[PDB]
Amino acid sequence: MIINNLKLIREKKKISQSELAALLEVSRQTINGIEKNKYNPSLQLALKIAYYLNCPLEDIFQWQP
Template sequence: MHLRNNLKMYRARENINQQEMGKMVGVSRQTISAIERGDYSPSVTLALEIAYYFKVPLEEIFYLEED
């Protein structure tokens, strides 16, 4: 199982770039980019902060997918 996400879609809906998203949740643009690519799994705290920012349940942005 792999952690997947819809972060890029949610950012596009809000018209914010990776740099702005990073500032909102206290990480770098590179971290946001790595999360979106699936190269980095955020901590539970960071994942919750991202979901809180978009005012959606965590599982709407982050979800597990079987290989």
């Protein structure tokens, strides 16, 4: 695998990691860990990220065989 564009997209929108974390009701450390590709979110958290960034999920998380 998964290519991960979360930091680029979040930054393009001038949304800080703290606001996004607050919207999602997760720790800022968890958003940072996802952005740094340390671990994957659940599907529901991924969908909530896409919802709050106003983009298709696949713009953020890309799987390729």
